[PDB]
């Protein structure tokens, strides 16, 4: 019965969007794919076009959520970083001690909105310098990093591990294992 | 300068659709996401809604393609299997000695359209019995199987390997390696 908000902006990495949405839904999580710009289709980084379930405006009214998920993609992450709406959502989630998950360049939106300073985090290797500007976080090379309520991951190739980490945090290890088996992961 | 046709039907596994599209585009392949039913958005197996680049009807007119890709998802694969349009596309691709790639339950569409009989193939473990009805193929447990112009794979967790195998077949090992590195795969 847990709920997840996935914030989808133009230029988001489509694999880092779809893998967590899919895997979370396999885990019985109620996932809302929310369009940052509105209800209209979103053109992702490699031109896959995804239709969000709702606008971020409407999705927020149906909160709170057990996890707020920020996909990567440099341009997508930048759009998340410049959004006042995202700032408010993340600050509220932080204030209520709710999980926040971000992957690849996604964690740089946490920096932009001053979220989770003092946490151990990882990012895509190419996003490290951006994330570490000011030394507000401690960097990790782990494929998935979880420091309390801040969960981060590195890239498309860590998206399954990232998604399963979210499932484990919300529904437990048993459910994560059950969901993992049919995926045919290495 | 290679070209790929990805046939997207209702109930397709969205991860097995997006990962190959994304990875192939990273490799400089011109990818066309073609909607089986038309130009309208496609509701995938876990409710991700993707807008195709064009209808399959229009996409065919812009052929031939260096690879025809069939995503999995049981209901998606069934829709592919029941389509006369898909039958024609696959038979033409086979006749011109062009690559055909299918993942998870996707290969069962090859069976339905009598494509590549005598080939070594793999599928999702749960799709094996369906695929092997009549013993027209030889089964493999390899995560990716390639027997000449028939390339198959097992599931969401083998989608990156599947995609990179397609890249290697079209653009070579060097390009595949270059595309792989930034993905942060295990």
Curated annotation (Swiss-Prot), chains A, B:
A Pfam family of this chain: DJ-1_PfpI
Modified residues (N6-acetyllysine): 146
Site, Cleavage: residue positions: 147-148
Annotated localization: Cell membrane; Cytoplasm; Nucleus; Membrane raft
Reactions catalysed: N(omega)-(1-hydroxy-2-oxopropyl)-L-arginyl-[protein] + H2O = lactate + L-arginyl-[protein] + H(+); N(6)-(1-hydroxy-2-oxopropyl)-L-lysyl-[protein] + H2O = lactate + L-lysyl-[protein] + H(+); S-(1-hydroxy-2-oxopropyl)-L-cysteinyl-[protein] + H2O = lactate + L-cysteinyl-[protein] + H(+); N(omega)-(1-hydroxy-2-oxoethyl)-L-arginyl-[protein] + H2O = L-arginyl-[protein] + glycolate + H(+)
GO biological process, alphabetically ordered: adult locomotory behavior; androgen receptor signaling pathway; autophagy; cellular detoxification of aldehyde; cellular detoxification of methylglyoxal; cellular response to glyoxal; cellular response to hydrogen peroxide; cellular response to oxidative stress
Impact upon substituting residue 161 to K: In PARK7; uncertain significance; no effect on detoxification activity on methylglyocal-adducted CoA
Effect of residue 177 to T: No effect on detoxification activity on methylglyocal-adducted CoA
Factors inducing expression: By hydrogen peroxide and UV irradiation. In pancreatic islets, expression increases under hyperglycemic conditions. Expression is also induced by sulforaphane, an isothiocyanate obtained from cruciferous vegetables.
Assigned keywords, A-Z: Acetylation, Autophagy, Cell membrane, Chaperone, Copper, Cytoplasm, Disease variant, DNA damage, DNA repair, Endoplasmic reticulum, Fertilization, Hydrolase, Inflammatory response, Isopeptide bond, Lipoprotein, Membrane, Mitochondrion, Neurodegeneration, Nucleus, Oxidation, Palmitate, Parkinson disease, Parkinsonism, Phosphoprotein, Protease, RNA-binding, Stress response, Tumor suppressor, Ubl conjugation, Zymogen
Keyword Acetylation: yes
Subcellular location, principal: membrane
PTM annotation: Sumoylated on Lys-128 by PIAS2 or PIAS4; which is enhanced after ultraviolet irradiation and essential for cell-growth promoting activity and transforming activity.
Reported tissue expression: Highly expressed in pancreas, kidney, skeletal muscle, liver, testis and heart. Detected at slightly lower levels in placenta and brain (at protein level). Detected in astrocytes, Sertoli cells, spermatogonia, spermatids and spermatozoa. Expressed by pancreatic islets at higher levels than surrounding exocrine tissues.
Record note on what altering residue 24 to I does: In PARK7; does not affect protein stability and degradation; does not interfere with homodimerization; decreased detoxification activity on methylglyocal-adducted CoA
Phosphotyrosine: residues bearing it: 65
Cross-link Glycyl lysine isopeptide (Lys-Gly) (interchain with G-Cter in SUMO), where in sequence: 128
GO CC terms: adherens junction; axon; cell body; chromatin; cytoplasm; cytosol; endoplasmic reticulum; extracellular exosome
PANTHER family: PARKINSON DISEASE PROTEIN 7 HOMOLOG, PROTEIN/NUCLEIC ACID DEGLYCASE DJ-1-RELATED
Purpose of the protein: Multifunctional protein with controversial molecular function which plays an important role in cell protection against oxidative stress and cell death acting as oxidative stress sensor and redox-sensitive chaperone and protease. It is involved in neuroprotective mechanisms like the stabilization of NFE2L2 and PINK1 proteins, male fertility as a positive regulator of androgen signaling pathway as well as cell growth and transformation through, for instance, the modulation of NF-kappa-B signaling pathway.
Subunit structure: Homodimer. Binds EFCAB6/DJBP and PIAS2. Part of a ternary complex containing PARK7, EFCAB6/DJBP and AR. Interacts (via N-terminus) with OTUD7B. Interacts with BBS1, HIPK1, CLCF1 and MTERF. Forms a complex with PINK1 and PRKN. Interacts (via C-terminus) with NCF1; the interaction is enhanced by LPS and modulates NCF1 phosphorylation and membrane translocation. Interacts with NENF.
Protein name per its UniProtKB record: Parkinson disease protein 7
The species this protein was found in: Homo sapiens (Human)
Lineage: Eukaryota, Metazoa, Chordata, Craniata, Vertebrata
């Amino acid at each position: 019965s847990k709920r997840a908000l996935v914030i989808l902006a133009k230029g988001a990495e489509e694999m880092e969007t779809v893998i967590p949405v899919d895997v979370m839904r396999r885990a019985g999580i109620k996932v809302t794919v929310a369009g940052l710009a509105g209800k209209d289709p979103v053109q992702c980084s490699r031109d896959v076009v995804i239709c969000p379930d709702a606008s971020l405006e409407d999705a927020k009214k149906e909160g709170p959520y057990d996890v707020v998920v920020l996909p990567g993609g440099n341009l997508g992450a930048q759009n998340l970083s410049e959004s006042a709406a995202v700032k408010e959502i993340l600050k509220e989630q932080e204030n209520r001690k709710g999980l926040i998950a971000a992957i690849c360049a996604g964690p740089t939106a946490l920096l932009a909105h001053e979220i989770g300073f003092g946490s151990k985090v990882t990012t895509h290797p190419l996003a490290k310098d951006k994330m570490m500007n000011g030394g507000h976080y401690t960097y990790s090379e782990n494929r998935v990093e979880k420091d309390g309520l801040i969960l981060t991951s590195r890239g498309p190739g860590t998206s399954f591990e990232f998604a399963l980490a979210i499932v484990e945090a919300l529904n437990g290890k048993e459910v994560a294992a059950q969901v993992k088996a049919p995926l045919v992961l290495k």
